[PDB]
Design a protein around this ligand. Sequence first.
Ligand SMILES: [Ca+2]
Ligand SMILES: [Ca+2]
Ligand SMILES: [Ca+2]
Ligand SMILES: [Ca+2]
Lengths: 376, 376, 376, 376
Amino acid sequence: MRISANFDGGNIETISLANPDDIQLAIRPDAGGEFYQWFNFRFEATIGKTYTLNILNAGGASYLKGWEDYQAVASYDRQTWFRLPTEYKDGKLSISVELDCEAIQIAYFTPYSYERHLDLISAVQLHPLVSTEHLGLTLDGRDMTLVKVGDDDPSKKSIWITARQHPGETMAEWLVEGLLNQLLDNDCPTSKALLDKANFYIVPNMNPDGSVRGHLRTNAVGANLNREWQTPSLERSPEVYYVVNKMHETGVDLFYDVHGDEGLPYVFLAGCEGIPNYSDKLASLQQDFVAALSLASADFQTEFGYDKDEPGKANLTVACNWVANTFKCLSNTLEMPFKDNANLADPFQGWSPERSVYFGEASLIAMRAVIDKIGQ
Amino acid sequence: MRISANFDGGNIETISLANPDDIQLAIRPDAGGEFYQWFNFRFEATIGKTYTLNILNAGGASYLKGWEDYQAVASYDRQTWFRLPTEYKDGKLSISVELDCEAIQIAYFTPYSYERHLDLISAVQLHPLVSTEHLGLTLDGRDMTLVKVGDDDPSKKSIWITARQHPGETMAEWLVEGLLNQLLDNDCPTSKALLDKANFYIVPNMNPDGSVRGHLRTNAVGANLNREWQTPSLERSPEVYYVVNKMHETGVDLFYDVHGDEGLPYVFLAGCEGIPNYSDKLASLQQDFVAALSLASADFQTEFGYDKDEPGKANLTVACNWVANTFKCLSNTLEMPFKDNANLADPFQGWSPERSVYFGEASLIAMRAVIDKIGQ
Amino acid sequence: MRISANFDGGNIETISLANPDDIQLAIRPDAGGEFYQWFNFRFEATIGKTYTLNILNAGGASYLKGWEDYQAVASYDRQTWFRLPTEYKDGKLSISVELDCEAIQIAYFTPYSYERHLDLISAVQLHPLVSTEHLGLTLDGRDMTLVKVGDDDPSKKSIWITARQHPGETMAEWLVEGLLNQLLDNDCPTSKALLDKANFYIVPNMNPDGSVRGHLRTNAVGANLNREWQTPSLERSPEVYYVVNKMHETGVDLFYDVHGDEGLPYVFLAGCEGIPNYSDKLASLQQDFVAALSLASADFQTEFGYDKDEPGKANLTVACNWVANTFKCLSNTLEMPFKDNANLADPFQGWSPERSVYFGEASLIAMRAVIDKIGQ
Amino acid sequence: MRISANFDGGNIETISLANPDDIQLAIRPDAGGEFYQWFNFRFEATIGKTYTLNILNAGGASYLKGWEDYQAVASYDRQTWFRLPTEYKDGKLSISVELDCEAIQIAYFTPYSYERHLDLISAVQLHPLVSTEHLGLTLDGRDMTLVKVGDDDPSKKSIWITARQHPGETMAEWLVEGLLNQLLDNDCPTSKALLDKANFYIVPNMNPDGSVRGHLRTNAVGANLNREWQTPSLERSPEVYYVVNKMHETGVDLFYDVHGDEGLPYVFLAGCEGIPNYSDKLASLQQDFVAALSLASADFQTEFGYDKDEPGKANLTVACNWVANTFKCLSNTLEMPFKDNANLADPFQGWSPERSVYFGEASLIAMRAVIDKIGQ
Ligand SMILES: [Ca+2]
Ligand SMILES: [Ca+2]
Ligand SMILES: [Ca+2]
Ligand SMILES: [Ca+2]
């Protein structure tokens, strides 16, 4: 029996490997010690036995609702990631592994490596309408890379799409890969139509450091990038600092910040209704966008989500709000579940990279729906 | 220099191969002599020369608007089909071939073989929710095959999708392949949602005989299958006869007859407003369907199309009308262009199998939009 | 219960579909009535039941040993082909089919349609060292296409590879497909080494008409092409006529005639030792070539095959002898089994396209082994 | 202008990005400071301009002949890797880069990341004859994974294949990738023939720590693993320690140690003729094996390589000698070039992963050639 986590995005501590029926494990907290929930490790043992893996400190994780009805994600081949029988009792998350192969990787969601990220931002370069741009360095010295899709025609609209501010929400980068694959297909009319009218500025990974470090919610020094938008710094939140400045060069006509929510088994938008600069026009663009997104995706819904902000009561340090209020534009945070969409449940895989990719495609349709309405 | 057409879907007659600057060719009429326009042949010559291929009887084709601004489709590898410089003057369609390889296939649209059809209806079988059904024989003795997708739960709605009644409109089968590939993907929520609520009855090729025979508009004996719907026969229109009877077993809650239009460079729906049984409900389902389809596809439009029928003035021998009137359901004919979509023009390839496939996907979204509204 | 053979390569006649425990069929003879063995048909019935299909005229097939230990080939998806439980007694070949899907295709070997042929000879054109050449028409008016691989440097050695003189021997064209794929990959050193020294003249299908017609062994007018090499004609055997004349333009340094054998469950070469121009030099090349092939491929063997010809007693109407005798060169007929390689049995699929593809690859290694020894 | 190496396998130090005509860099030494040559970095600048990149400490690299006629490897998409114009004078290696895309990755050979390693050893698990076995941890805490191919029948012969003891020699793991793919294809007869007679013990990466760290030649603590075979330890060389102990459990009948050579532009084997247990029998197997390899692969040659050891004078701390001497078996070191195969030059890419994959395939043929001759 073996457990391991020394690789890109790994996160587990081994407490005890003595008992096959009680393998004891712990999640390692994000830097700064204030958050955790993401785990990602590899387990090797004799096949044909059923093992119980106990994450002892699940009860100390940042979002305990996220453990309720949750099933761990696992893969034998690192290609197909499926769900495992999981339960949460006495502060511990118990995972049953009926090992069909010697080696299995188990994680909070399907991982997305820095090697994969590098392949994605390198490959999109070949497209004639694509140019990548080095925004700057992360605190560990990794690259903040901007994918610009379009012909930089100043008359076109500006669409900003940021994903993975919270590194453990890997479904965010997965969606951005799906969306890029569809946008970069000229045979797709939505893509052609969009690119005829807009330039895209896309950041597939807002937080490479937290990503490689196996953090749930913070960068290298423990900053929550989604509170850094109003007063970002090079010292603490360079990741947001460069994005914010670029936005000032480009303008923003539509903003889509892609996230993952631990506790709620639904896909939902959370808008910026509480910003001081909210308006009837913005209200109206939101209704149109939500209308379009519901038609575009059967995974989308509007019953469950976060509470709305009272008027003027928005937290202007949050990307969605800060962008909306600063650039007076349609702006949303998208949340996809770590669990599954309870409305269209899939017990074999729950929410998955495949469904995140489909939501990336549905997203471009919602955008096209409002393309002629956004901007000036 | 050589010209050839003896293969599945081939259609050309060689008048003269004497002059490289004036290769003379003719389209062979459908059986019964009343229609033609489709051509499909192979041409071999010395590379690096530019040849002029003249289809002498273009002026005698069934739809002369279809020659205006039309460019022939061609391929070196039978995978990527592109457009050739083409002109229509003095009743002849002139195609310039700057031969980059020894062998090129040139056709009215991308062909879709019976071998390809057999692969498609064989492959879908592997899906757990798919069963194919032999409806009967065509007049040449080929197979009319029905693809049933779903679990045959009698409480579910019935969706009928028929394509390629007119064999030369190959874009119809191409769309049906795209649509099946998307419908049979469980990761797609639209697919899951649809199949939760409906059973699909799909005929990827209404006219195998006309298809293999290289006809534009008719089956083996020259019948136009889209006038056979009210009084079909085994002797003359077995293809429609078996479909019509099956419909009586299944019911129809939505009908989608997939077609191609020669003269108009637009995608458009043609509905059944002129049926005696038209109603406010049917009017309303049509508006919803059209609304959804416009949001789903940037290739769709609603300005151009056919003229609407005066009330009660529908031709009830046409599938769209006959089905709508008989089963009192949302029913449409879809027309995709042999030219290109003038709104999102693509000079390298015009309308293509790739775009037809995308329209198949957009179609499932339009359907889902009305899934809860159709039926009783 | 339905039986059908109306499609490219189809061959069966239905005697009786009355009894599911005794479906009665017969193999249609080749044009000329002299031969048969090849069959290919589609069967549709009810899944979950086991049907017995009896080819009542198997006892009159051309090679009766071909029936002993033979198992029929089948596919539900037309991509994976596998063996069905088969027995031969009292002149009847009995195939058991427990239908998992409604439709299944059953054949003597995996079919290779003309549409596939067209895809192959078209696709290879894109390679910068490939040119196709139209040799002329078949009797039914289809193409005899020569695939030329190399820089056409007339100083180089000439390698001729011909497959499928007997149409039912589809494995031969599967092998050429595999040989071309590898030969066209420049990262393969054997490929690079060969093209530096030789030009290739490859005919993936010697008998397109026999192929489409579902014949075992003859072209459209009942000619056995492999007895036409000495005195062919445009009116009986144009297929051979054009190749013989091209060989005279190009010369021949190595000849490989790809065939399939019904009776022996082994892979073997048959040489041309009986030709009047046989020489020590030729016998030496043959041993070099056989050794190399034994090393290149574990499926090859040299214990079983055809008896050798006595000195001078070869039939010069057979390609291998005629070529060897005319061009004084290394020349073999390759025979692959319809059954399996008894030495490396595979019950699920027996001999297959994939194994044929691998043997194509091994053939290039054998050829490379004699590349500097051949020619002049 | 940006230079970066913070990623798996990264290696460069930036001296000066002041002048685009003289970008100044240096190669970081391996832990221990004794060796270097491997480099790997990403460069972002402005497209359309030609930049010169000068590695100023090339003159202190471990193998200076490695620089003569060497051309650097690069990629814009991280899928296709090609050679850049390079020269070496006055101790500096000068790379010319005319940037077509903004970002390019430049390396000594095509990188092979640990994430890719994990994909490989995970994917192969799905094969029914493959088991992975965790041998233990590396010094940095990564996995030493043994890939076992076969039915584990202890009566069979034992074939051991080890690659990438020197981390920078990535071609070795590319070769194992290609060898595994082919070995796991049951339609390949050599594969089938081998697994009927042998079990395989394959280590695709002998030095994961050196690999992630961007080392040429040493593990995490500066150890040259290929001098550790006689007296390894858990604390300096656990990588070799676990393999040596496993070999003692399994026995060894054929050993293949996969390496890359900096200096010679050729593929060659280095045997173990200097071992005290050398025998006529071993010399015979070696000639059989060399002959077979010469036949299997046109990239192989036997004129150039390392000088041979005198009788008895081999260094038994080197794997090939230690194994040959300990198990009295056929044993070779394979060396592939960083440059190219001077005998089959390819300017666009020189020696490459794809050629390495092909050589993996050729290696199975060579092994098959001695399969019944080896063992006991
Ligand atoms: Ca988040
Ligand atoms: Ca039509
Ligand atoms: Ca034959
Ligand atoms: Ca080495």
